[PDB]
Assembly symmetry: C3
């Protein structure tokens, strides 16, 4: 534990089905006001924050070529409750023989106290996580 | 609600042709000394800065296989008027059937007041600033 | 000037064989306590750190399809002197036309004084340091 608000949650291996964020420990972090509610991060005070997140996709051979992987970081203010696209990226893996497609999103944003941030993916069934650090989501107060 | 120099500009949808950075946007930034001139960021004081940027490429089927996507972050010091390769990455999509190839660049650098930073791409025809959060460029003073 | 611990080492072109981190100056960093020993970064004090790294892979035509590129950032505490995956990602280039697959890893972690951090890759044969800004590794104290 230390100064400024901070969070660094990680995927859930046993949650084989969806993308659930957990407060584990190597240093998976979550303190100084920041809390995890409804699988989302909640900022404490007003200020500039650094938001980042990565997800790894994995597949055993392509179906056809109509496959698209997406990762996004939306911001939900308390006034409204809509998921405005802060950081978004897309990937088209296609076109034994496995395939892997990682995605990283990073950026600095001005956040207001009470805000709710989240990181979602469209195809949580390719979501790879057969190892520590292959998918995470975090933020820090600057 | 702020203090250190900071910038987080984004692509321009209507600039269908080139990569133009904009700031007059809700969750976008550009303040505390940092200004956007000639489509480039300009640092205020001397110090360590975090520079990041992402771009998303999109295509509708490959031409052949001789296609290379590149994203770079160069530095230009006032006196020495010359681009310095700070962050660079390359991608080869190729080898009906669309393709999405994102690229993220991040790093911490010591900058001198008056410096001019920029983020460029070689094939602005493959640029895909479709939805929000897809293509951006920012920096922050640590 | 600045005063928190910081490091931003880069690949070694002439080290044609392995991934060697170098710190001369500039446009890379390594100061304020942080040192580079045994090709690894060593933290000075206890606190939250931002760790990032990127590597670029390059190839001249695929062998078959059984090729996997990996980049990882392991930790090593004073107590248990063994690695600890902090950030890991994988990529599969294959599904004489060349190819380019970059990988970026970023995250915030709580580090204890005396810790040793490193960034490794499984196939240092494609590790592409032909240009500047293509392969780097750094950290900063928040």
């Amino acid at each position: 534990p230390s100064d400024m608000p901070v969070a660094h949650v990680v995927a859930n291996p046993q949650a084989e089905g969806q993308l659930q964020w957990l407060n584990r420990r190597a240093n998976a972090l979550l303190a100084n006001g920041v809390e995890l509610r409804d699988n989302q991060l909640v900022v404490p005070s007003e200020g500039l924050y650094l938001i980042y997140s990565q997800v790894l996709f994995s597949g055993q051979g392509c179906p056809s070529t109509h496959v698209l992987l997406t990762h996004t970081i939306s911001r939900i203010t308390p006034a409204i409750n809509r998921p405005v696209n802060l950081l978004s990226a897309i990937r088209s893996p296609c076109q034994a023989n496995p395939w892997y497609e990682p995605i990283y999103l990073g950026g600095v944003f001005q956040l207001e106290p009470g805000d709710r941030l989240s990181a979602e993916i469209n195809r949580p069934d390719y979501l790879d996580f057969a190892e520590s650090g292959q998918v995470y989501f975090g933020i820090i107060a600057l």
